[PDB]
Design a protein around this ligand. Structure first.
Ligand SMILES: Cc1cc2nc3c(=O)[nH]c(=O)nc-3n(C[C@H](O)[C@H](O)[C@H](O)COP(=O)(O)O)c2cc1C
Ligand SMILES: Cc1cc2nc3c(=O)[nH]c(=O)nc-3n(C[C@H](O)[C@H](O)[C@H](O)COP(=O)(O)O)c2cc1C
Lengths: 199, 199
């Protein structure tokens, strides 16, 4: 359905859907296609330091349980339930995309192109963001709800250990997706003439 | 022409075109539309710290002359001509998009959401990257060649001063665009099974 929708609509219709349920139509195969297309997003010096680990169903829920538990040890009793309430809408989804950045790659590129050594650490985040956003738009184009979460770095250690992630991969973000199950919130924009100037 | 092309093609067909010429069909108005659509890209906490300053024709060339001159003072005589050779393909274009990030916004958001104070500086780069990439894809969808350059921070001061840019705006990148005038270079990809793991 990412062929149906044209570019402009894909940009404008992608919204953050924080509550998603399950659906058997959303398969590992379909996800596979989305990620293969998304990998066409560019990277500085084509270093392609981005890494994606997709957790589906069984493993998907396990992750969000990890988050819930990590929060249980860092939040006062009175705020716990309120803090983990939002985790429900993710845990209910089909799966979650874990976005990592290969730090060994960034470090090596800093050696090969010392003239940009200070920029590579940022281009690392830029490249991963472009990739994250592409995946997001593609999923929405296919009628799959998704949102971008950030439970790093508090869940990093645990996640890394339970899924044998190289030490050089740093967790950048998590994208829980699934059959949409909430109406996107209203979004406001600063007036255009304030963010854009022509000369 | 960004309605013609569908999403998947927009992702796959966007390439870096480093040599662009002029064309009167590429107007400030058309550019305007592209940027208004691109601003639908998301920002952390919807802080929208991104800022874009478009330099067209007269002012476009002036910028690239600034780059050329800045390089003339930082590069040994023997390497000058080789270093500024690539600047020709940009200077020949229609215009250039200057991507800034409002630092006062990032700093304020660090105050409002101290729980993510360490992430905002990176989300700043992420948000701007998502925006940069969207603009890039939209331009290509409309048959306009473009590339992403990084002459910051060496030209920052000069640019800031000759175009009255608030001090809190940091230069993140430059996108010279125009009538395509070069065939995109071959691009290679690391094997998919190495960047994507399923569980
Ligand atoms: C964060 C980031 C920084 C980049 N910086 C530069 C740059 O300074 N100069 C340049 O010519 N290209 C730069 N690029 C562009 C990449 O080299 C380019 O996107 C990639 O090789 C492009 O492949 P493309 O033609 O295949 O799609 C940058 C790309 C990213 C994602
Ligand atoms: C760099 C970056 C970090 C973000 N982090 C979070 C997060 O931790 N939690 C969350 O619910 N949304 C997060 N978001 C999502 C933004 O709040 C969201 O994209 C924006 O408000 C979405 O508008 P959308 O529904 O209109 O298109 C992040 C977005 C960006 C660009």
């Amino acid at each position: 359905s990412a062929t149906t929708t044209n570019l402009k609509e894909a940009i404008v219709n992608r919204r953050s859907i924080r509550k998603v349920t399950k659906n058997d139509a959303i398969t590992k195969e379909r996800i596979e296609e989305v990620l293969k297309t998304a990998l066409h997003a560019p990277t500085s010096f084509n270093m392609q330091s981005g890494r994606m680990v997709v957790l589906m169903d069984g493993e998907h829920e396990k992750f969000w349980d990890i988050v819930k538990e990590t929060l249980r040890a860092r939040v006062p009793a009175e705020n716990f339930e309120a803090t983990v309430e939002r985790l429900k809408g993710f845990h209910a989804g089909v799966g979650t995309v874990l976005f990592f950045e290969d730090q060994a790659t960034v470090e090596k590129m800093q050696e090969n192109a010392p003239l940009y050594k200070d920029q590579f650490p940022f281009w690392s985040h830029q490249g991963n963001a472009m990739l994250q956003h592409t995946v997001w738009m593609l999923l929405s184009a296919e009628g799959i709800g998704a949102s971008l979460q950030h439970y790093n770095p508090i869940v990093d250690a645990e996640v890394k250990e339970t899924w044998n992630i190289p030490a050089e991969w740093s967790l950048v973000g998590q994208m829980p997706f699934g059959e949409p199950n909430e109406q996107p919130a209203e979004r406001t924009f600063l007036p255009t003439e304030d963010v854009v100037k022509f000369y």
